Write a protein that binds this ligand. Sequence first.
Ligand SMILES: [Fe+3]
Length: 321
Amino acid sequence: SVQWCAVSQPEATKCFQWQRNMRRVRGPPVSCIKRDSPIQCIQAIAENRADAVTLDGGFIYEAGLAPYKLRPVAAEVYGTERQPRTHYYAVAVVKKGGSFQLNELQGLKSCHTGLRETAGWNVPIGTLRPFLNWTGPPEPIEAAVARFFSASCVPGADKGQFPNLCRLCAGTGENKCAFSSQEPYFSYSGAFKCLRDGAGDVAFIRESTVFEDLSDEAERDEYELLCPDNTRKPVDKFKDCHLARVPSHAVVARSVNGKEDAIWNLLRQAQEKFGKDKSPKFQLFGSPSGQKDLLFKDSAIGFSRVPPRIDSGLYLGSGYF
Ligand SMILES: [Fe+3]
């Protein structure tokens, strides 16, 4: 059986609902282990306490490093089934109206999905380094991003070394700027909720965020991207307007004693049984109200296996950071 590494109690429930659903249709068994962060799941996967966790490509990096040496075994498949894609695009949605283009970015307000996450940090801050004012290490990149935006909401950051990287955040108590769903401006939806709530001027996120959160058409007509060419275009045309194409989020496992084939078969079967539009009982690519992307990304259709011994640095592709 496969111990899945849950990252929160909402995620844990989803997984416990998963396991109960797998039993009912007599498929491959899944188990749930709870831990509090992606980086905390890696270690447990590394320490034989559990076996898989879906990670973003920033955590695919840090999970391939020593002494973890974890490996991407199955990539998330997003889109439509007529045209499947194992990649997504980092864009920067902004409020329609303003004159500022990608190059005009300084002293504004940015909402970021997570510190060190792919779409909300690695790509945009990687795209803004020429504009950034940064001498190099051992000063972190965090300090300059503190001085480039007038305030942001980049959860996961240090509340004391960089206070305006959290300035915009909305978690209450000690929960502000945390890498948890209790930060309501955490991840994609929270990075979008931070622009939608009038909090920041820019939202660094993915191409489906706007289609996913804003159901009624007219509402979305009021949002736009920021093109890397310094223009701004509509949010439906992200294929000619984006910060980058980034490889899809992936289930990562152990390199040695990984159980890959068992993990592949749990997924495969669950995708056939609890996939998009498959069972009315369980949607493995679905979350309940207010919660989002638990275990896997919402509105993703399935998975496509990763070919033998493709490391973490080859999954991502060359040309990183
Ligand atoms: Fe991501």
